[PDB]
Design a protein around this ligand. Sequence first.
Ligand code: FES
Lengths: 128, 252, 677, 93
Amino acid sequence: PPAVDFAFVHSVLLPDGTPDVHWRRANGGQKLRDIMLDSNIELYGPYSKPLSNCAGVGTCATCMVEIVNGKELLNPRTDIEKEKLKRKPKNWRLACQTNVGNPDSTGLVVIQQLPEWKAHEWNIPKNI
Amino acid sequence: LLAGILLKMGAYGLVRINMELLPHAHSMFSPWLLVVGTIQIIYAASTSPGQRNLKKRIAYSSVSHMGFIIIGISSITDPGLNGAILQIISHGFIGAALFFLAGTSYDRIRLVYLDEMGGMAISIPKIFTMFTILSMASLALPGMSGFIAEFIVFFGIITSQKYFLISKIFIIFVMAIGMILTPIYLLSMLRQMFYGYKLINIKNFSFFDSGPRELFLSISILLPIIGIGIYPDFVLSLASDKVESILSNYFY
Amino acid sequence: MEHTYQYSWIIPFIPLPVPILLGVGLLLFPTATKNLRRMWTFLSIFLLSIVMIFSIYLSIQQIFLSCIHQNVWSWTINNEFSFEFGYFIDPLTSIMSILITTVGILVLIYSDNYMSHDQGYLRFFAYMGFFNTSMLGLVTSSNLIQVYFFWELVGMCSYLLIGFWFTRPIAANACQKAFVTNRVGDFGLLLGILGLYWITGSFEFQDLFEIFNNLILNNRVNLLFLTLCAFLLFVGPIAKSAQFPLHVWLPDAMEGPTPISALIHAATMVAAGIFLVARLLPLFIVIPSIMYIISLIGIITVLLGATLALAQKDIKRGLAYSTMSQLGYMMLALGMGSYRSALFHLITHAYSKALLFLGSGSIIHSMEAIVGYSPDKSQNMILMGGLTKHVPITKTAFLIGTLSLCGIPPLACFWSKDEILNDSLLFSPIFAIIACSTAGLTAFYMFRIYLLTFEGHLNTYFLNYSGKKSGSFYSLSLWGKEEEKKLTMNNTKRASFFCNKTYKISNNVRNQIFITVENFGLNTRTFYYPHESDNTILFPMLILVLFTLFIGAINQEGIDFDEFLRNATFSVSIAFFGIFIAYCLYKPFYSSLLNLTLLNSFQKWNSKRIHWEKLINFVYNWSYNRGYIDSFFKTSLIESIRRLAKQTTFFDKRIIDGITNGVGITSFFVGEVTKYI
Amino acid sequence: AVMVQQIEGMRDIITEKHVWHLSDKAIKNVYMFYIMFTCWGCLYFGSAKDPFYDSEEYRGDGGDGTGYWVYETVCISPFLILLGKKEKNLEMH
Ligand code: FES
């Protein structure tokens, strides 16, 4: 079956000093917010309270996730990721405004959830 | 002095020549001058946010406040004409002080328009506080003479023997939109040239504030505005007898 | 009575000279008066204490003796004006005077320390004292002239307080919108008092009350003119008490101080509209349709003020919409004709939500040590989390305030809302059950606010969330001298160093070599937990706790000053229902008092988030877009005036300055032609 | 000065009505003293260290006291550098 290989690196470190990766499974692409809600990984952080989110429409920058090596199978920004978050390191997307695409999809996108409240920089490779 | 006293002659002459020398044709055309003054207030108060320039906003603000003088002259009443004389003196102070502070603000900041010249109130706080209080004097906002000037003009409208209720409701409504439009351009001027913060302006410029001379100019114009805005008989008591002698020719 | 009302003219003018001395001090000698920094604070507090004691003495004489004093002087005597500026001592004057003075003294005691780390100090207290001057002059006012006078001065002071922090531009947009909205109400108050002068010829609060007993029985006056005059007279209280058309100025007032949130509203200035409508109720019960209009505007804004405070991230904006919904309750009471219960609800809200704002600002000044200085950080109610463990007296004060709004009978304020719904259900069945429904919603969002602030873990120092916190707590690793000499530059450990091989997949390794270089430890390691604020913050909160416990039980003084169990238990049941719905949603599992079988079944019945995914979306989009009324006013009311301004300066500069310039252009052109002919 | 007002609606009113007016002479007197204050302030604050219109920020660059010294400065000093550039090219730079 077509299984996209999310990694979902958590924001905080382990107390040992290594990151903890969870490697979620869910099929295809419908919304990244629905995948992170369904497969039980921590999207919102402190905004995970019930009325602390816009329930998927994009009117709040609360589902933001740093995505690295995520130029392969992803939709472009819907002028809401371009507007809610503006002065960012440009690898940050809204899970309720991004989508990893079609159900026939294989890929190794790795997503750092909660780019707010983190301490690592990921040392991104310079494109082009 | 172009806005303080040179703008108010003519309006003086509309009381001097066009009201006691020619009473009956003034009674003929003051129905039209009333409507023209009500269009004048809204028109000039709406041309003022369209001005990117600083000083032109105060120029059209002067055109807007002359509408109350034209209306008080056209209001065939003692409260109308007496509020017109009060608005003559009040806006003489108001326009004089605002164009003074606009000239000093251009001399400090060297920026004419209002797309540039952002937050300058931390740079020149004395010019800011005097320009703010004199903007409040321009707002027909109380403790200031423009308030009681425009309110006695409204009272001259509402106590008119010339006009009926069909006209008076429309006149009061159009004039009272003007005291909504006047905060729009005055506070737009204030939030453009004073409110805000520019990152480049920290210590290298360090602009000189209002000196004591210009501050005496602003305070010495501000004090009779307050003294009339709390006790308006500094204007009405020296002219009410003469306005009675004027309106003796109109009411018979 | 013989010698105490003749000196009732001072209670506006007693706060005045310290803003007069600051307005000539800061404007002339800034180093001098700012060197006298804390003395003008205590001088304003002392002058307001004089006004407090004198207003208490006048209140004691009002509850003893039934009389009204109207100590009017003369202001202009030239023609038909004969204007007065006198001071009208009704029981409403006493209520409003103590309501101004007590709240103002407590906010000044609060603001001695709120502004104690502010470069802008004395001009704030000049604005405070001049606002107290203006509002005490507004409530001691014998004619609509002076109401209009101090009304617009209160609007100016609102502009100044909201744009106090003038260097930030969102406060600039806030204060411009605030003063323009207050001028839209000022507009209506103007052509409303002029319409009353055309219908009466009065300009006095005395003669209106004895003309409107028989003015509608006349043939010259029109009923249409009286009802449109009274509606325009009500447009003013719409702008002050933040009613449904003119409500968009209130939630932007947050960008200024928190004391101006406690004083511009939950206090004096939103009580200006309540004061005006309750003062003019002898000419509002007479005009038939305006009472229904006031009931209608109140019943429209109570659903707006409730649904807005449901999903606010900001503490101050949420308490602002709570204030707006309670002000809608007050206008709904004023639409009942209730001369008594409206003012009592005004008193208990103005002493309750003022305490709530001071508790919120104590929360904010505690959070400033955590997050630094930012309103999206230090005012965000989401990441406040829990502060019961840290700031206990703030917790008790804020809890007594939110129970004073949730309607708890013994140890909070309930009898006001009891009288509201009791006067509501025997009036019209449409307005009543929706008022009780909004009361349940009010208990819901207020308990939501209390749980998001004080109950639970902190949401900011929580080890699941902050990575700098996990880097700071663990100064050494779990193995000591093994696995590293410490490791920095932790590489792409997708395989977790397990040498895991790959089946049929897209990719495992590539030319992507990105090391998650984390931050270090043992640097700014402390992260000082939010301790208690000083005495100048708790002391107004203690005094307001004593107020909201003392007023909450007030053979009664209901008549001499100016269904029993079923309705009470129905209001307490719907309020506790709101408590319960907020409690099961926000109170965490380790501290809730409920049985864990029911607590498990709450998520077991609702683990879908599909029939919740539209409801939460609609409520959050409503509270975030401000019912889309903010966007519609910034789209077709102020940008419509911007387009009209550009069209009008186009007509000016192009085609009436064009004609005048074209006269000279034509003279130049005919001169150049007839030169060369 | 005491008038008891009987209104059926709320309560009785004990209006005072101290009708007064600043004496005709006193308006001339406050005008006299305010013209005196204007005189004193014009003389003294013209005799003051005027901190902006003395420095090299204002008097140095342009600073004739008009409102066009900025515009003739930025319209003539480029002509000054064009003149200096031509005189530089006159000696083959
Ligand atoms: S949940 Fe509102 S941002 Fe995705």
